[PDB]
Amino acid sequence: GDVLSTHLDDARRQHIAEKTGKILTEFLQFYEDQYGVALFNSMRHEIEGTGLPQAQLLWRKVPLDERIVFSGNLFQHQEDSKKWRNRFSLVPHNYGLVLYENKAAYERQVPPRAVINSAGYKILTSVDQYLELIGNSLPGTTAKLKCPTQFPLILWHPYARHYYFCMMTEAEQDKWQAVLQDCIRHCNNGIPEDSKVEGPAFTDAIRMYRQSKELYGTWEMLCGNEVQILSNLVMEELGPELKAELGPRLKGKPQERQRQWIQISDAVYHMVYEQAKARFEEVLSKVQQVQPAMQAVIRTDMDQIITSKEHLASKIRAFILPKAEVCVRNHVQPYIPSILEALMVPTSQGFTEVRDVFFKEVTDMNLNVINEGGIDKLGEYMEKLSRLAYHPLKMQSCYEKMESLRLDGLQQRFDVSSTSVFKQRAQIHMREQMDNAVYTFETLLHQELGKGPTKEELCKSIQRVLERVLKKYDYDSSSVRKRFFREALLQISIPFLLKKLAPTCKSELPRFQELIFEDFARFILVENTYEEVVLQTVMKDILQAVKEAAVQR
């Protein structure tokens, strides 16, 4: 039989589901523990009024009207037939990649042949690059795919299936590379950053689970929505032993064996995804049911919870602060300036490029008003400007500023994962700030225009509204960048410290549990309090490094 029927038979699928279920159970215990802590922290910020200050730019409240992002014909390699077929390929408003047999089939409202969420994917523009990337997916390879055009585009994922496209011209290749890069970035941004409770509870639980498996530091596969990330977590853990078991059973030449493993991995990824979805959504519903009860206890007992948290922290400080401060002084503090410099330069270039692109587009609109000498086509020009933050070409020069980013870890070595994650996060911030700029410009211009078509010439109020939005932009850009640099420095330095401190602490921390009043245990965790103690040991150096640099400008 075929590869999947042979190697993923019912018995093997049951074993995989059992192992997956054990991982999900352990993760969900971390998640339920984290949930009340995330709730307490968010409520403390709101009640004490210590959340993020209000931005100067306005934020769009309703999404833009849904429009197709891009479409065109592509060739796609077909896994079943091994034949290349034309496909009409469409990117909807939500940045899925949708493939139809042809455009005529699309017009007749025929179902799509595939709908692809590209979270966790990477783009390759040559077959050799792709073969190099998968070349060591099975062991011992060095211990002794052919495209109809010269312009391929390949989508690779560590666990899910790979897609093979090609285009007729370098121009089409370049366009689809930008669009698919936008798709990946959009799908990776699957948990809203301003989620108050669910987001932080989930991502902290992921980190704590990984730490319990002795995995510290930024994780490249913390991308996509919750179920995708959980699927990545399971595949990371189960992949090695599944590969060790099935690898020797695969028959053929090295690249054929590599392709069979990709097919097996995708099938397991699907099975894991559905199992994780069911298990996670069950627990999410359970925590949401008791969240109001938790809110009442937090609101009533706020001051006593803070007191209990501070008492626990004081005992942890007494235990770990000497060794922590030495480790920061000797092994973190010397390197904070260099890491900050590496992050600041491309990030600040990118935010400045957003400003320049915004300024040019508003001026181009202003030129149109002067040329028609009138207000009457403003709605047409504002509609195009309203979408600038999602323009598949015009934003590319901003995003490109991040590709020179190279970050060392605290072993003074290039950190691939930190670099990847922080380029993605920086680019998402750039998209947000561009959208805020054009939304603010539109809103303020409409206000200004209530004065009348020519109380003074329209191009004077346009340029005055533009100058007002630019000052709001410059303020918000510095706010956003300072927060981003602080967050990134913390996310590089704290996992390093926790790993160095683990032989001292991991056996000893449970002894502090007895200090937590049982009715507060959903809101206070020994581990989280300990991690906050460690965080405070780098806070001075980080705030001062971002201060002394004044990197936020």
Numbering used by the authors: 2 to 145, 152 to 560
What's the publication's text?
Here, we report the first crystal structure of MINERVA lacking the C-terminal flexible region, which contains the PH domain and a helix bundle domain with a novel fold. The trypsin digestion greatly aided production of large single crystals of MINERVAΔC suitable for data collection, and hence was implemented for crystallizations of the native and SeMet-substituted MINERVAΔC. Using the SeMet-substituted structure as a molecular replacement (MR) model, we could successfully resolve the native MINERVAΔC structure for residues Gly2–Lys145 and Leu152–Arg560 at higher resolution. The structure of MINERVAΔC could be divided into two domains, the PH domain (residues Ile69–Asn196) and a helix bundle domain comprising the rest of the molecule, which exhibits a distorted L-shape where the PH domain is held at the corner of the helix bundle. The overall architecture of the helix bundle domain resembles no other known structure, as analyzed by Dali structural similarity search algorithm, suggesting that it is of a novel fold. The N-terminal PH domain is tightly held by the helix bundle domain that acts as a pincer-like scaffold, with a large contact area of 1573.4 Å2. The N-terminal PH domain adopts a typical fold of a PH domain containing a central curved antiparallel β-sheet (β5↑-β6↓-β7↑-β1↓-β2↑-β3↓-β4↑) followed by a C-terminal α-helix, α5. The spatial arrangement of the two domains allows the N-terminus of the protein to be located adjacent to the PH domain in proximity, presumably for cooperative action of myristoylated Gly2 residue and the PH domain for membrane localization of MINERVA. Surface representation of the protein reveals that MINERVA possesses a positively charged patch on its membrane-interacting face, which is mainly composed of positively charged residues Lys83, Lys84, Arg86, Lys104, Arg109, Arg114, Lys145, and Lys153 of the PH domain and Arg256, Lys258, and Lys260 of the helix bundle domain, presumably enabling stable interactions of MINERVA with the plasma membrane (top view).
